[model samples]
Target: GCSSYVIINTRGTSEPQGPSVGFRTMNTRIRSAVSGGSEYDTVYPAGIDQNSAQGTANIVAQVKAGLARNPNTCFLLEGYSQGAAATCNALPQLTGAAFDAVKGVILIGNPEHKPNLACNVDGNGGKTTFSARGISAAFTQGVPSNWVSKTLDICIYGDGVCDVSSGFGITPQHLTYGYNTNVQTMGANFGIKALQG
Candidate 1:
């Protein structure tokens, strides 16, 4: 339900939920969690249009920009449906020096777009360690797992876009989990736990 959410706090994005725009509701929910955190901005990269290769580039630039401010900042890459797929495609591009700054990743739904890509690998295809990686692996990143060093939680929900069976088109129909208390609780619990970590 989270597609069409190109910018959570910025402009230039299309109005989600049609003419009735649910922007206020979405903002109200996330703002409460991010208020005392840090500066929050958004970017719309050239490649992330529709369901194309640019989608990957769009996120890479965003991630880079987010890191530029604080490379070691913990990130929560939550997405649903096709956005989750875009998250998977963006992983491989985040290579070289960009790997050093990431602190964590949390994919709300399991991604199925590019399943073969190894997340902890550098551009040279050599395996490496990440601050933390999960919410996409379908398993918790235990301390022993070479891929995850911190806390990364992945959980699915009813009508989740994980199976890629939902209707497409980059709308927020699949990303807005606040309607369901279970999903909301899951996100809150994980976010709080991640902050504690």
Candidate 2:
């Protein structure tokens, strides 16, 4: 089956604005990781509002539609910061076939990261990976346990977005994941392997 990729942009962020950070970097990584001739799509939210339920719903609908259009497509969902939060919020809604279509999920600086899951460093200096377990709340939910192996949640040390234990307060590190070449390289490689599966 032919596979494709999808990237959800960060809040208040898009291509025409700057280097485009995670989305662009990730897209390139995925493309480079795989063989030739793969389709890719970048999904942008309506606004920077993280609490907008409709915004997440819209993104989910787009992903579902994409899967419907091509069942052979294997998606690599990538998000950063607020986009990461929105992506996590949208996970529970992805049930049955749509959820099954997802091949990999990469999240950076996610604010809605569930603390109950494993929180350990990924051996990249200060980088860490959060667990996808127990994210389902009264209002939102998370991916199924079966999807855990394919999901990678990266939270930089001291980044208040996903890692709050450092008590270092909100620093500039949170925004660095998208631009950090090492992290991007490692993450991209991980995504590629997941997609290959």
Candidate 3:
């Protein structure tokens, strides 16, 4: 394939329109580490009503148009919280060349997290999340097997959203991926490796 790239970020529920807070630092880090590619923050309601279904639609739409413009353009999917759930939805939905163009996926504070998957990693990407599963894992199917190698499901140890074993409440842990320097560096390194040809 030729060479063009972009990082797509989808924000959590009730988040304002713009680049997601969880990925603001990550997008910068990817650019700094690799020195190429563009950034696309998905536009969707992200409201309580649809519960991030629009996030999935916008993700697919952008990648569809993006591939049309540049067939060789690669995508790095970044999703946070509710945005993570939408990414999970979009993963299996995206197919053929659209799916092939995806080079990397980073999920933060995901509600669809499942324990012991190869992609399940701590915020720093060092260790597994252990036995902890996302609160919604009870019903959500979680990351597709095909996307596992290229994906990183990042959850802080005590995050209530993804680490249900930590107990009730969304807590500060779920919100930590946005500002945590260690995690930012981890994701930057991972993407850099994945983006390598």
Candidate 3 error regions (>4 Å): none
Against the true structure, candidate 2 reaches a TM-score of 0.75
Task: Report the lDDT tens digits of candidate 1 across residue range 1-197.
Answer: 11111221211123232211212333344435543343223233323233424545656777677667655454444433334445455556666545443334433333342122333221122322122223233432122233244323232322223322333323353345335454455445544444434
Model 3 lDDT on a 0 to 1 scale: 0.84
- Of the two candidates 1 and 3, the one with more favorable TM-score, higher being better, is 3
Summarize candidate 3's per-residue lDDT along 36-125 as a digit string, tens digits.
Answer: 588888888888763787889999998999999878788999999889999999999889999888988999988899888888888666
Clashing pairs in 2: none
Question: Each candidate: what lDDT?
Answer: 0.37, 0.58, 0.84
Task: Report the number of the highest-lDDT candidate.
Answer: 3
How many pairs of residues collide in each model? 12, 0, 0
Q: For residues 1-197, write the lDDT of model 2, one tens digit per residue.
A: 33565544434233332324654576676777676324333344425444546546665886787777776666666666656666676777777887877777777666655544432233262434443222223244443465566677676666655655642434577667767776677677777777676
- The residue-level lDDT of candidate 3 at 22 comes to 88
